[PDB]
């Protein structure tokens, strides 16, 4: 499968999440995604085919994971934006007030701005600290997906949002949205991963 930020994958033939970013660890291919999407060694499938397994994760506390892929997967420096793509250029962290977009299999590609950093989300499982908040909307299924600036700087992976009964927070004004992501930089240094860029 071609590994592109934002596309759907399933975990153990049950949950769905979205790919965050193509990365390598030495000769190993992988992608980063959210920790709550799977436990270590859970099987990841894209389009019905097994592409790899969860190698490590931390959830709750943090929310991060990376999936190690078989050699047959093609890693690409890109994030899906409809039928088009945003090229991943690096991972300079943007500041509050910066515009940012996110990509995932439920709501597609949505943009907004970063509104706050170091937010704690209190999920049923326990708190996850250190999250950045944006007001781009998102929905159930978008977890793990890419948050990236238009300029191609990878910001992090989707963690959670104040979804309403329709499964997303796209039907309430941007002012009332809290869409949270896990910063990419600590995931990259914690697992010794290098981002695929183009």
């Amino acid at each position: 499968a071609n590994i592109v930020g934002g596309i759907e994958y399933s975990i153990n033939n049950a949950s769905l999440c979205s790919v965050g970013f193509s990365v390598t660890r030495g000769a190993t291919k992988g992608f980063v995604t959210a920790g709550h999407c799977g436990t270590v060694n859970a099987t990841a499938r894209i389009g019905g085919a097994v592409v790899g397994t969860f190698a490590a994760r931390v959830f709750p506390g943090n929310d991060r994971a990376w999936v190690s892929l078989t050699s047959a997967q093609t890693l690409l420096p890109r994030v899906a934006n409809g039928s088009s793509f945003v090229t991943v250029r690096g991972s300079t962290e943007a500041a509050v007030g910066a515009a940012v977009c996110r990509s995932g299999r439920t709501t597609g590609y949505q943009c907004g701005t970063i509104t706050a950093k170091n937010v704690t989300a209190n999920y049923a499982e326990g708190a996850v600290r250190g999250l950045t908040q944006g007001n781009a909307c998102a929905g159930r299924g978008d977890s793990g997906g890419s948050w990236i600036t238009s300029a191609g700087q990878a910001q992090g992976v989707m963690s959670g949002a104040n979804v309403q009964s329709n499964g997303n927070n796209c039907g309430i004004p941007a002012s009332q949205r809290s869409s949270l992501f896990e910063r990419l930089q600590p995931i990259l240094s914690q697992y010794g991963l290098s981002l695929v860029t183009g």
Binding site: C17, A34, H36, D63, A121, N122, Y123, A124, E125, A138, G139, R140, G141, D142, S143, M158, S159, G160, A161, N162, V163, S178, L180
Partner: peptide, 4 residues
């Protein structure tokens, strides 16, 4: 907010 809830996970996703």
């Amino acid at each position: 907010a809830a996970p996703a």
